[PDB]
């Protein structure tokens, strides 16, 4: 029943590979639906063509700022921001998909893919999915990151949608 969406990743416009995600619509339906719709672009805006602006190896990959490309933008399908839906699910290890935010109830479109267990984020960031296929591709992306998060090459979402 839970939806699966994919990102096709490019590095300086060179294809890298495909990452797919299971979204936990059974446990966080509002947050899952935002990401699903941003991935298909069915509301008229979304993730296609956007970059991962912050990648810290041994920590996370962060993206979803499709309006300013640097961590200061983005918007949800519900408006500029929406509430923290629940914190049922925890940051248990690599492959977890969690919402970036700027305080309580400030979810937009930014998300991160954890590449480590990040338990200190539990109860503060809404977990809403997990990598299903292509974790090896996330690991390859990680290698273009750095300690301060700047990427050495431009890591983009070349295509995305629902499988």
From Swiss-Prot:
It comes from the Eukaryota. It is found in: Cytoplasm; Secreted; Nucleus. There is a cross-link at residues 27, 81 (Glycyl lysine isopeptide (Lys-Gly) (interchain with G-Cter in SUMO2)). InterPro entries: Cyclophilin-like_dom_sf, Cyclophilin-type_PPIase, Cyclophilin-type_PPIase_CS, Cyclophilin-type_PPIase_dom. The modification Phosphoserine is found at residue 76. The modification N-acetylvaline is found at residue 1. Interacts with protein phosphatase PPP3CA/calcineurin A. Interacts with PRPF19 isoform 2 (via N-terminus). Interacts with isoform 2 of BSG/CD147. Interacts with FOXO1; the interaction promotes FOXO1 dephosphorylation, nuclear accumulation and transcriptional activity. Interacts with integrin ITGA2B:ITGB3; the interaction is ROS and peptidyl-prolyl cis-trans isomerase (PPIase) activity-dependent and is increased in the presence of thrombin. Interacts with MAP3K5. (Microbial infection) Interacts with HIV-1 capsid protein. This is Peptidyl-prolyl cis-trans isomerase A. It comes from Homo sapiens. The gene is PPIA.
């Amino acid at each position: 029943v839970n939806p699966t969406v994919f990102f096709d990743i490019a590095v300086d416009g060179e294809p890298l590979g495909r990452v797919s995600f299971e979204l936990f619509a059974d446990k966080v339906p509002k947050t899952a639906e935002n990401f699903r719709a941003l991935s298909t672009g069915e509301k008229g805006f979304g993730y296609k063509g956007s970059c991962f602006h912050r990648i810290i190896p041994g920590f996370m990959c962060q993206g979803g700022d499709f309006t300013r490309h640097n961590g200061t933008g983005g918007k949800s399908i519900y408006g500029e921001k929406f509430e923290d839906e629940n914190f049922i699910l925890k940051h248990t290890g690599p492959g977890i998909l969690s919402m970036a935010n700027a305080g309580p109830n400030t979810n937009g479109s930014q998300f991160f893919i954890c590449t480590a267990k990040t338990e200190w984020l539990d109860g503060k960031h809404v977990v809403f999915g997990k990598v299903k296929e292509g974790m090896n591709i996330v690991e390859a992306m990680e290698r273009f990151g750095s300690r301060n998060g700047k990427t050495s090459k431009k890591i983009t979402i070349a295509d995305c949608g629902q499988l």
